[PDB]
Amino acid sequence: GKGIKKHLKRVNAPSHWMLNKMGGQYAPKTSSGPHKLLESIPLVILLRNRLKYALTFDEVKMILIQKIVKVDNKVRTDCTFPVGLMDVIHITKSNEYFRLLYDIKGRFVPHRITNEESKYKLCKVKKILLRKGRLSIAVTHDGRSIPYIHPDVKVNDTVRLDLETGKVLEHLKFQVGSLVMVTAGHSVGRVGVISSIDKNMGTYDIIHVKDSRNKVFATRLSNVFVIGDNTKPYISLPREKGIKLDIIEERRNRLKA
């Protein structure tokens, strides 16, 4: 048969997973869920190789069995569950909240987040659909189908999502002052306010994004994540603060200690 492959080779694992080459030849294939395998990572490596909480699959699973790991305040027991680009995960008894953000190099790193900001999660919508009764339901990048969205919300506008009530709070547009985050582009990891767009005739629309250091970089429209307006990032950024510090002048920063 040629059915769905139920294995993932270690060498074929995505680069940001960072799997040792000698630690076997199989990678934990993420189960079907809210996000794609390439742009999401499993709790296994999240808590074994990134959090360093566990050292083995068996101990990862016996941590997982207890309802102490919560994503969006929802307990999860799928061992290879795709967390996604942007989400809120919580560990209860030790009372910590991790928001999955990017890194300037372009990896996945959990970021410490308080309860208040954890209650404030953002989802980029993908498309809106009209159903029976002339009602519009919009699907986010998290595979989340939220019905009854604001009429002012557009296809590329992002919407504030509340975790408990599962409701929309406020929409953010794609304006020249819209602070965005490149999701899967070659310039992944750099935050920017966008400088302009170019509406091309039926091809991948590109946008030129302006950095804090006046660096202009072009990336596709299909892989951006509006994270707030020009006032401030609505999401607590990681230590690197979303500024792609250059490779040549990274070594001078690294060498002083």
Partner: protein
């Protein structure tokens, strides 16, 4: 199935192996450095030729080039860490002109000879093979170890060596003298 542990080679065959000038120069080098065979004096030129080719590639780039100063500062930092030349030799042209003995001198089997300890380079080599040397907090007995600039200041005799405070002398000889002395007494 196949091992994923990458492996490579270090020594390259000199080709036309029967040239007298090159053979005699290699004999000069091995005599002055107290080596054991030709594999090391075939590997070393590969070592100082890899970064020489890197310098060749770097030179043709123009000035104020992002890759050029990047790789230049990286290679120069490695140069100063390994201590091939002093502070006065800083330029890429300066680090291009390297010879065999200067790369050789940073080997332990001659560094310990320069510091003393042994009265011959071969004596130093057999000592370090007999693991009577200490690099400082770390145990080393490989003569081809490349001492950096900062590793030189704490080179001393091995702590577990008999001359480093361990067992004074031959167990059999000491037992024999003590037993003959007690038998006489």
């Amino acid at each position: 199935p196949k091992s994923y542990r990458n492996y490579s080679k270090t020594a390259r065959n000199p080709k036309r192996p029967f040239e007298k000038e090159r053979l005699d120069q290699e004999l000069k080098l091995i005599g002055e450095y107290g080596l054991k065979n030709k594999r090391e004096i075939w590997r070393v030129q590969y070592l100082l030729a890899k970064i020489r080719s890197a310098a060749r590639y770097l030179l043709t780039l123009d000035e104020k080039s992002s890759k050029r100063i990047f790789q230049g500062e990286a290679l120069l930092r490695r140069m100063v860490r390994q201590g091939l030349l002093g502070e006065n030799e800083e330029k890429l042209d300066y680090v291009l002109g390297l010879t065999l003995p200067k790369l050789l001198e940073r080997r332990l089997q001659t560094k310990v000879f320069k510091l003393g300890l042994a009265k011959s380079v071969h004596h130093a080599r057999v000592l370090i093979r007999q693991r009577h040397i200490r690099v400082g907090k770390q145990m080393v007995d490989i003569p081809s170890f490349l001492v950096r600039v900062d590793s030189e200041k704490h080179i001393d005799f091995a702590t577990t060596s008999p001359f480093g405070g361990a067992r004074p002398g031959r167990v059999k000889r000491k037992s024999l003298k003590k037993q003959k002395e007690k038998t006489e007494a």
